[PDB]
Amino acid sequence: QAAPSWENIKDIRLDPKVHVDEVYEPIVNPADRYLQHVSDLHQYAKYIMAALPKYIQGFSVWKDELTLHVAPSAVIPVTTFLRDNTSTQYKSIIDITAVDYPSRENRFEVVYNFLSVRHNSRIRLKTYATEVTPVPSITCLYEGANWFEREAYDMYGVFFEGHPDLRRIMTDYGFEGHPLRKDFPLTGYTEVRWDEEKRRVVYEPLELTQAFRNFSAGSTAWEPVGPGRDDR
């Protein structure tokens, strides 16, 4: 068209631009879009349960997504399936990483989010691994893994297995420790750097901060008790 912007043809409008009323945002529903999909997805989890009953543990469905619990010694036969089945044509991984809860004797749950392409459907798959014992990687199945599992190893020390180039990416190259363990805090052990006397040797020390991270240690009565919902 014409009559758009400067070098003006003297034609403009900033008037009569309204829709004056009182709002009518009639809604109450928190999560009801998902309930038919949750009822479908229970049945999908029951299919995955009955199909591979040796290698799987209990499924866990929550709010339009799905998480399969897997015994950690046997993940590779599970993920030869379920990436690559006809009925489960996922073929696209989106996250492998880890979560510590240092409550239990096994310490680091390892969490995988996968993505379908034909089906527009995510999934989650968990193992549990200890700092002591490794669990095998999934780089044998596809090539998108070998970067992420480096990230998992660096943030946790969740040691892996059957994998090429298990380096560090996410820390300093002489830095031991593992940050996303809840063992050592935010400051780190040795984090200083200075270079005056032994010239340019930016060598660490004991990291003595200038004001410590004064925490948040307040907590109210109790959050909520969940209004459960399942298909069955």
Binding site: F159, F160, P164, D165, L166, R167, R168, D172, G174, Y203
Partner: protein, 116 residues
């Protein structure tokens, strides 16, 4: 789909095999010492590197479990991986070497009287 200096991750079962594997790791980690002194231009000598490498492995002579010795082997071979080329820099590299005394001045003689 690649490596850099053939880092492999496959922990064996038997403690004898892990012994031999750490032994060959020690040989490469010791052989690379003039390559280290070339690469980083340290002040000290190659035998200082060798006695400190020997010190580092004698730090974990008496570790029992092979399932701890696995990830100790991974740490050793992996820091060999990050030392055999120029990933580490000399400021990063001197974190193994408490070399000089004169930085400290007079200090604790490990007596109780001079804690005060």
């Amino acid at each position: 789909i690649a490596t850099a200096f053939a880092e492999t991750v496959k922990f064996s079962g038997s403690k004898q095999e892990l012994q031999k594997r750490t032994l060959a790791l020690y040989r490469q980690f010791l052989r690379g010492a003039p390559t280290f002194a070339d690469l980083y231009e340290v002040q000290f000598s190659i035998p200082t590197i060798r006695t400190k490498i020997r010190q580092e492995f004698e730090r974990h002579r008496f570790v029992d479990d092979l399932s701890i010795q696995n990830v100790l082997y991974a740490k050793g071979h992996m820091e060999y991986q990050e030392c055999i080329n120029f990933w580490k820099q000399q400021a990063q590299f001197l974190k193994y070497f408490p070399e000089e005394d004169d930085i400290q001045g007079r200090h604790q003689p490990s007596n109780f009287v001079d804690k005060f």
